[PDB]
């Protein structure tokens, strides 16, 4: 139930002149690990900086660390409860962490914080695998779509909603509509991919994921999802290679020492270990326990760079 962000102690950005600009340059260079350290430094130096907390939060999600993402976005939300990108990110990370109620609440705050849509809050307004707020969210989002059908973000929010109710074929249509309206959005491509995989269409998901990687080559979360798709297809050696790549890039050689990274990296190593067991390669399992990348870089021909 942690509310304090566990800052990485190994952070050279704490003595950089311009960490915020560095972080944004690192995002532009597709380096999530470095961008997160830079935003962390900003959050330590300027704790009321809404943008630094928000960017730390979205960057950690992209770096496959939802737990840190949520803590960072929760700070951003405290400082500015109208920050709509904060609500959008929280709805996503909550959905991933199966916090269905928090995801519903974030979707509502996302819509109702928008001047375009806030009037919908004044409107006077089971057979679904969701709680009852889920029908309300449906009405609100469909009312918004009726007055503004070509807002891609309305479609993306329905996609999130339909994930929460395990309606993955519907979600996929939502995210398809969102990428049609905004095709350069790496996040939306990833969401379509995850939705297809969750709906047992890993071959289609891999297509979406390759689109997202084309846009953001450092999108560690997409690389994790690629491993998941291969794994669900029982293509264990390919999954093991992809997760190794995810791991390598998640660290980016920033060499983290903090408790935060300790727990957030473990789920990637867990997936590697399960893949190793399904490959009948128990001889590699102990290295997976010690989180030692070296034998995997060697094993999967990734010695050059991830």
């Amino acid at each position: 139930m942690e509310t304090n962000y566990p800052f990485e102690p190994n952070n050279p950005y704490m003595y950089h002149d311009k960490p915020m600009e560095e972080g944004i340059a690192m995002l532009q260079l597709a380096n999530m690990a470095e961008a997160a350290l830079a935003f962390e430094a900003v959050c330590q130096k300027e704790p009321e900086n809404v943008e630094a907390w928000r960017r730390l939060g979205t960057t950690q999600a992209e770096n496959e660390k939802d737990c840190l993402a949520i803590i960072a976005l929760n700070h951003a939300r405290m400082l500015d409860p109208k920050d709509i990108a904060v609500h959008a990110a929280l709805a996503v990370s909550h959905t991933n962490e199966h916090n269905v109620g928090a995801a519903l609440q974030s979707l509502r705050s996302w819509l109702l914080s928008q001047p375009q849509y806030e009037h919908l809050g004044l409107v006077d307004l089971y057979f679904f695998a969701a709680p009852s707020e889920y029908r309300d969210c449906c009405t609100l989002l469909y009312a918004a779509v009726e007055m503004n059908p070509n807002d891609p973000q309305l479609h993306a929010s329905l996609g999130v909603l339909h994930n929460l109710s395990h309606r993955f074929d519907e979600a996929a249509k939502n995210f398809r509509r969102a990428v049609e309206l905004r095709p350069d959005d790496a996040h939306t491509w990833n969401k379509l991919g995850a939705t297809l995989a969750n709906g047992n269409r890993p071959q289609e998901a891999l297509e979406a994921y390759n689109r997202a990687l084309d846009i953001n080559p450092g999108y560690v979360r997409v690389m994790y999802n690629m491993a998941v798709s291969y794994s669900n297809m029982a293509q264990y050696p390919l999954a093991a290679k992809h997760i190794t790549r995810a791991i390598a890039l998640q660290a980016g050689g920033t060499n983290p020492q903090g408790e935060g990274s300790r727990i957030a990296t473990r789920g990637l190593w867990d997936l590697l270990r399960m893949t190793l067991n399904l490959m009948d390669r128990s001889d590699l399992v102990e290295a997976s326990w010690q989180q030692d990348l070296t034998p995997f870089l060697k094993e999967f021909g990734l010695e050059d760079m991830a």
Partner: peptide, 5 residues
Amino acid sequence: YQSKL
């Protein structure tokens, strides 16, 4: 496994 949005 579950894929992440």
